[PDB]
Amino acid sequence: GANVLVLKSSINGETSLTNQLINEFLAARQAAGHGDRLTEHDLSAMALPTLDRPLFAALRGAVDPQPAIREAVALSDQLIAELKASDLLVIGAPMYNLNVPTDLKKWFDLVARARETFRYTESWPQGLVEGVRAVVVSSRGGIHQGETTDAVTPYLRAVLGLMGIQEVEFIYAEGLDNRPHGRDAGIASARAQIARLAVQA
Amino acid sequence: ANVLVLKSSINGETSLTNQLINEFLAARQAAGHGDRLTEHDLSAMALPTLDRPLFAALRGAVDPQPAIREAVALSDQLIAELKASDLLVIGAPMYNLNVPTDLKKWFDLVARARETFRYTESWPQGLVEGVRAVVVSSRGGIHQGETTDAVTPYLRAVLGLMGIQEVEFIYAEGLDNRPHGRDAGIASARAQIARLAVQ
Ligand SMILES: Cc1cc2nc3c(=O)[nH]c(=O)nc-3n(C[C@H](O)[C@H](O)[C@H](O)COP(=O)(O)O)c2cc1C
Ligand SMILES: Cc1cc2nc3c(=O)[nH]c(=O)nc-3n(C[C@H](O)[C@H](O)[C@H](O)COP(=O)(O)O)c2cc1C
Numbered sequence: 001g002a003n004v005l006v007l008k009s010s011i012n013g014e015t016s017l018t019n020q021l022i023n024e025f026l027a028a029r030q031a032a033g034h035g036d037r038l039t040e041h042d043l044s045a046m047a048l049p050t051l052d053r054p055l056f057a058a059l060r061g062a063v064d065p066q067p068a069i070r071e072a073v074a075l076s077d078q079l080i081a082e083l084k085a086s087d088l089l090v091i092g093a094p095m096y097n098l099n100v101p102t103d104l105k106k107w108f109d110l111v112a113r114a115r116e117t118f119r120y121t122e123s124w125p126q127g128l129v130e131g132v133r134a135v136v137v138s139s140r141g142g143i144h145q146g147e148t149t150d151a152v153t154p155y156l157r158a159v160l161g162l163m164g165i166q167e168v169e170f171i172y173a174e175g176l177d178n179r180p181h182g183r184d185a186g187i188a189s190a191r192a193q194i195a196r197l198a199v200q201a
Numbered sequence: 202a203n204v205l206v207l208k209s210s211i212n213g214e215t216s217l218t219n220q221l222i223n224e225f226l227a228a229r230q231a232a233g234h235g236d237r238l239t240e241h242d243l244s245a246m247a248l249p250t251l252d253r254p255l256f257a258a259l260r261g262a263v264d265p266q267p268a269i270r271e272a273v274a275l276s277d278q279l280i281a282e283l284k285a286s287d288l289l290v291i292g293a294p295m296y297n298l299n300v301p302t303d304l305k306k307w308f309d310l311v312a313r314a315r316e317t318f319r320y321t322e323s324w325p326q327g328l329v330e331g332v333r334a335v336v337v338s339s340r341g342g343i344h345q346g347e348t349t350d351a352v353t354p355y356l357r358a359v360l361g362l363m364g365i366q367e368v369e370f371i372y373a374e375g376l377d378n379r380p381h382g383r384d385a386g387i388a389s390a391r392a393q394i395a396r397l398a399v400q
């Protein structure tokens with residue numbers, strides 16, 4: 001089977017379209033014969049710490065006695081270990097205010113750590129996450145795919161690429177603010193992309 | 202001018218974007234602009250993360266319940282400050298190919314339907330007028346004009362949403378290449394600051 005790490009960042013809980021389409025993508029993989037081993041985080045419910053001065057110092061190797069900082073460092077180590085153990089990373093990244101949801105960005109700020117998931121100080125750029133590919137589910141109220149207003153796509157390609165995750169496929173559901181038919185059209189397009197992506201290992 | 206200054210670095214007194222912001226504002230005073238400053242260190246303000254109950258209150262779908270009232274009043278305050286300004290100066294160093302979390306948390310409190318933008322039948326319409334922006338963005342690597350710069354299009358798009366179409370950037374890049382890269386990027390930013398402050 002595959003070790004699949006699933007990140008849900010929507011604030012709309014069990015009514016989330018990105019969480020629905022993630023669940024459909026995982027069901028489609030099961031139907032295509034992948035017996036996945038899921039590690040799932042609802043980042044919206046996890047109250048991840050924000051990166052601040054003391055946490056940044058501690059993640060780079062400073063010894064910080066402070067107990068909140070010691071367990072934010074342990075949380076960073078756990079999240080990085082899950083990432084490196086996975087074969088497939090599935091990310092819910094609906095567009096909120098031209099960016100990803102804050103809880104997804106807080107996950108990246110805990111896993112994107114020099115000497116843990118990348119190196120920036122060597123003669124050439126080096127990712128340290130190997131054998132991991134990503135599928136991003138990104139719904140939007142408006143239409144943005146291939147437009148200058150889509151910073152989400154290049155942001156996720158660049159931060160995943162920093163860590164060595166070069167293979168990133170997107171499931172887009174756009175124009176969802178045009179209800180009901182724009183939303184139906186966008187979900188139909190997403191479901192056709194799910195069908196095409198579900199067979200690959 | 203009424204200048205709204207947002208600092209988002211986590212590097213405290215060693216922050217390069219906070220230093221370059223201070224140098225930009227001082228260059229304006231040297232050029233004879235008598236600016237009135239409103240300054241927020243967003244890293245010290247513990248802004249709330251946008252979650253379902255806050256979003257419901259900010260969109261006006263529900264009255265704010267007691268524990269959220271403060272966050273709604275903060276949103277209204279930050280938006281009033283923005284609409285009262287002529288010039289918005291933003292510290293946005295690149296952290297993990299994005300802006301710092303505290304800057305994003307500011308945008309999630311001010312980018313608000315019926316307050317800074319309005320739904321139309323096609324594209325959303327900005328409600329903030331008379332505001333131009335200057336963004337100070339330092340980077341360890343070199344990203345300007347490259348597909349790895351998502352910070353620049355993100356900021357142009359969320360500022361553009363609210364009606365802020367005039368956005369100038371001050372870049373200090375290649376700072377992880379020391380000693381020459383850091384000195385070279387800061388000298389480039391200072392030359393950009395001097396060109397901008399005289400306007
Ligand atoms: C806080 C917030 C901000 C949003 N900002 C944008 C935006 O900048 N552009 C856009 O096209 N849609 C925007 N939308 C619409 C969402 O992208 C769209 O509804 C999406 O399908 C929501 O996904 P979810 O149900 O998984 O949360 C926003 C929605 C929310 C809740
Ligand atoms: C948490 C963190 C993450 C960073 N990520 C990046 C990165 O993605 N790309 C880059 O070129 N530099 C990166 N850097 C380097 C900063 O962009 C650079 O040091 C900048 O000048 C810091 O600005 P400041 O001192 O105002 O906080 C990062 C630095 C920090 C502290």
Ligand SMILES: CSc1cccc(Nc2c3cccc-3[nH]c3ccccc23)c1
Pocket residue numbers: 051056059060109110112113114120297341342377
């Ligand atoms: C989230 S903890 C952490 C620990 C160590 C490093 C980083 N990020 C950095 C970069 C990522 C791309 C280029 C970078 N250049 C840097 C220069 C100075 C300080 C940090 C970084 C983050």
Ligand SMILES: CSc1cccc(Nc2c3cccc-3[nH]c3ccccc23)c1
Pocket residue numbers: 097141142177251256259260309310311312313314325362
């Ligand atoms: C941070 S409070 C807030 C209140 C109201 C609206 C928003 N943002 C939205 C957009 C901004 C660009 C296009 C958008 N489409 C949306 C569709 C549904 C719900 C919200 C939005 C945010």
